[PDB]
Design a protein around this ligand. Structure first.
Ligand SMILES: NC(=O)c1ccc[n+]([C@@H]2O[C@H](COP(=O)([O-])OP(=O)(O)OC[C@H]3O[C@@H](n4cnc5c(N)ncnc54)[C@H](O)[C@@H]3O)[C@@H](O)[C@H]2O)c1
Ligand SMILES: NC(=O)c1ccc[n+]([C@@H]2O[C@H](COP(=O)([O-])OP(=O)(O)OC[C@H]3O[C@@H](n4cnc5c(N)ncnc54)[C@H](O)[C@@H]3O)[C@@H](O)[C@H]2O)c1
Ligand SMILES: NC(=O)c1ccc[n+]([C@@H]2O[C@H](COP(=O)([O-])OP(=O)(O)OC[C@H]3O[C@@H](n4cnc5c(N)ncnc54)[C@H](O)[C@@H]3O)[C@@H](O)[C@H]2O)c1
Ligand SMILES: NC(=O)c1ccc[n+]([C@@H]2O[C@H](COP(=O)([O-])OP(=O)(O)OC[C@H]3O[C@@H](n4cnc5c(N)ncnc54)[C@H](O)[C@@H]3O)[C@@H](O)[C@H]2O)c1
Ligand SMILES: O=[N+]([O-])c1ccc(F)c(O)c1
Ligand SMILES: O=[N+]([O-])c1ccc(F)c(O)c1
Ligand SMILES: O=[N+]([O-])c1ccc(F)c(O)c1
Ligand SMILES: O=[N+]([O-])c1ccc(F)c(O)c1
Ligand code: NA
Ligand code: NA
Ligand code: NA
Ligand code: NA
Lengths: 252, 252, 252, 252
């Protein structure tokens, strides 16, 4: 019951971190609208979780987002929290292998998709003194090799989170982000499978953290529920969920 | 029950932020040892809260700290979380008004007191896979006018928190800090009373945050319970509880 | 002679910060290619400065950028430093007043324009062990009111700078950025003129810094010459040229 | 001639980074007072460099510092820049191997020594609109394994630098710090010699940077001359001279 009576929209909620966030909020008593552009994960989740329902929505299609918000209000009567988790990490690409076209496409998903849902949802979040939680990345703050476009998209997300927190603070709407590090998800697993030695890549990924393992979507979920339900003097913050990857010297 | 069965030591727990942290952990099901060098607040708190008990301890006196830890283990049989909240902010002092003697005294309380309890407690925290939470300050990261020694003490706390998180991560002991901003406490109130216009000073303190108010000890308490009970992939982090004071342009 | 024999491209070099950067590099002995999409400032600068020449180039038009690089090499035979200063700050806009269309347009100038020149120039910078300097902003790191799209563009620039520094470090190409704060430029002056009380807005802008004044383009120029000529163990850094605006408490 | 006519005090200037800083400032036209508690390096440097002279001074002995400042003024008639470089890094020590006594001793050198010279010098720096440059460390911001006391001392230095920049900005005195990473110095070499495999330790130290080498004292010197002579809109900043060690993922 930490977030009972509340209504939460999670984008990219059908698998991975989003699915962990969906589960965290349901376990806290909220009703959750799972947004995802693929049917498979989200529809199963909705069958599994009383209190979660699934609405197909591609966050890069404005009308989809418009319909997502209006369906949430029509079905549930309020909107308290928006979690902008939908995003993608391309495979490793050297700078000269990137293109301005792929860059823009990544910006559409990772940055503009977050911007659009937030914009359409803020009128309802103002009425509920709700809050916005963006899922960014540690590599927006510290960089990453072979990921110029992706790093750039997360740099904008973290900064935009602080700018929005300024604009919306007079209206009681808090805006925060979570910067996860290595989190074991289908995306991390997909990228590993494209490496020459997948198990070497995964073992390297675990050791990149002092804690010696990768994170779990459930641990990002717990951070998200904290930001929504118990962090009322927190706005514009970047909550690091990284196992300490940013600390200390390493092999670069 | 988020931290049921756990044993927590909070220093400076008799009033202010510490008292908020004590209450947060009791409400989460932990048993709490209130450490404080003044009897008044802590003994009242212990009478008020089933599950909290009070042990007089001056964190700058090593033998007091030694006895604090041994009493906690003898009475409760385990130690899961140490909250190093005991600390002090001197009144405003221009650089030339400070002295190397007052600086050292402040370092004894704000930095070495935290170091000593952490050192004596870590053997028990290793057995319990417990965690350490230091209460630092936003002004360690961004500075503050007329507070060179105080800012320095909190700079060391935040950095030490990251160094300790590195050393202790192989042993499963997480080490994090909270950086509060303006939190309305007896200390904030005492400092205001020394200003020519106390109500002007307090009104200025509220507006230094975009949220337009100061924080409450209970909100630092919620952040502390989160770090202890739900943040298992978080180590070496600095959790900002500031109402957004670090964001954006202001009058300097 | 600190950068004698070197060839520098400065975008947005016809006025403002860019013009200060152009002048700084000419004074250091480099030859400078002034890139700008307006003729007026840059052509005057080229007449004024032996060693600086002007090439019309809109950094959002790829073929313009392609021609800019090929003209620089054809005329000067090498390329050592690229300064991505071309950028724009829209007038104040509340979040709900922004659009996804204006956002993309701003991303084209502030982020993709920087990306394109850097990409086309890196092959020549690799041959010369040259370096890249992006002009970002303090408000990418700390946010700003009524500037969600602009803040986002600078968030991506700072992050991209770190990602590129990683990719290019094995090839001896350093990549850094400068984050200016309030710098008195025609852009700052234009924005002030749209305020109800322009002189109030400017006076507020000066006081937002502890130093009590805004910065000068020449001071950003000095920082840029330092990064190019003397900072060979610096890569991926964010050099703050802000008069201390990010320090301490203020009125928010 | 970038700093001609100016008078600079460098502590710990007899070898290592300090010696690089001394040489940088002499090459810029300043007269330099080499402060060091060992005679050997500093006296040789003074014989070698016209414009540099050597004064024996232990920065932890207040009367030594008092005499250092009065000798500088008596001999040279002004004081423009103070570089607080004297400091020490203990050998690797696990947390439980440290003591509150060694911690205090380290604080005396790394933090209080910097504080004392700065205090005694500020009256003269105010008359000259001079500036203060503290040599801190990257590991104050990101931590380091087996160096709790050392990391803490540098955490306080960086924070104190920002607090002092606030207090002194109304008086025209800028206060900045440099955070070097791995710099090849006699201290780095001494620590390596205590490792089981010294050449393995050094090779590991080079690879901890994306640039693939350690830094040179001359590169810290160049950063210091920049902060003194050309960075007049910079105060309270932390100039990273690290070869990019803080960027990206590594082996932790
Ligand atoms: N280590 C990590 O995996 C890691 C670290 C830092 C940040 N992140 C971020 O966490 C978020 C989730 O990543 P993940 O690892 O869970 O990935 P994932 O690939 O496992 O899941 C992402 C989900 O988003 C959905 N999605 C993708 N594009 C969408 C669109 N246009 N509209 C709607 N839904 C869309 C996908 O269908 C999928 O269900 C992303 O923003 C990612 O950048 C991940
Ligand atoms: N705005 C704020 O008040 C604020 C902001 C940032 C950080 N902090 C930090 O929060 C912590 C608590 O501050 P507060 O505002 O609650 O202050 P407070 O003065 O209201 O309470 C501090 C408590 O610590 C106790 N204490 C002091 N010295 C001690 C010692 N040597 N041994 C044991 N106990 C000791 C006092 O008796 C008191 O009960 C401090 O570390 C402070 O620096 C406060
Ligand atoms: N306080 C400040 O003014 C401040 C602070 C932080 C960052 N910045 C950044 O500094 C840079 C310069 O800003 P300024 O204040 O000097 O502005 P400015 O408006 O005075 O000058 C910018 C110049 O860039 C040119 N330009 C614009 N769009 C271009 C394009 N598509 N192609 C080529 N040239 C183009 C303009 O013609 C102009 O000459 C920008 O990136 C800005 O965001 C400025
Ligand atoms: N990689 C690095 O070596 C590195 C990285 C970051 C920061 N730093 C900092 O750079 C500074 C210089 O380090 P270094 O590597 O050049 O070390 P170093 O040991 O080679 O030289 C330090 C000098 O300071 C002098 N000194 C020591 N204690 C003193 C005292 N009490 N009074 C006066 N002089 C004293 C010594 O005699 C010596 O000449 C230190 O503050 C250190 O923490 C070094
Ligand atoms: O596998 N990924 O998609 C991934 C790994 C680490 C990150 F920090 C990140 O943003 C994304
Ligand atoms: O009132 N104080 O003691 C106080 C106020 C603000 C801070 F950030 C702080 O560390 C302490
Ligand atoms: O006036 N400007 O365009 C302006 C002012 C301050 C900033 F930090 C900035 O990026 C832009
Ligand atoms: O060898 N050292 O003393 C050393 C190495 C790296 C650091 F960042 C440092 O502060 C000190
Ligand atoms: Na359901
Ligand atoms: Na009790
Ligand atoms: Na010319
Ligand atoms: Na000499």
């Amino acid at each position: 019951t930490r977030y009972a009576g509340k209504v939460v929209v999670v984008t990219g909620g059908g698998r991975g971190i989003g699915a962990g966030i969906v589960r965290a909020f349901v376990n806290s008593g909220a009703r959750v609208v799972i947004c995802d552009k693929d049917e498979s994960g989200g529809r199963a989740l909705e069958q599994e979780l009383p209190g979660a329902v699934f609405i197909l929505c591609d966050v890069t299609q404005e009308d989809d987002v418009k319909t997502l918000v209006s369906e949430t209000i029509r079905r549930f009567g309020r909107l308290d929290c928006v979690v902008n988790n939908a995003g993608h990490h391309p495979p490793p690409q050297r700078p000269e292998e990137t293109s301005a076209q792929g860059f823009r496409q990544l910006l559409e998903l990772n940055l503009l998709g977050t911007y659009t849902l937030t914009k359409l949802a803020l009128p309802y979040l103002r009425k509920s003194q709700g809050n916005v939680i963006n899922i960014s990345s540690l590599v927006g703050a510290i960089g990453q090799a072979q990921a110029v476009p992706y790093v750039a998209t997360k740099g904008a997300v973290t900064a935009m989170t602080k700018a929005l927190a300024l604009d919306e603070s007079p209206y009681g709407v808090r805006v925060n982000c979570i910067s996860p590090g290595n989190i074991w998800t289908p995306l991390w697993e997909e990228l590993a499978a494209l490496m020459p030695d997948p198990r070497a890549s995964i073992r390297e990924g675990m050791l990149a953290q002092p804690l010696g393992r990768m994170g779990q979507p459930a641990e990002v979920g717990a951070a998200a529920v904290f930001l929504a339900s118990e962090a009322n003097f927190c706005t514009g913050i970047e909550l690091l969920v990284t196992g300490g990857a940013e600390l200390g010297y390493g092999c670069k």
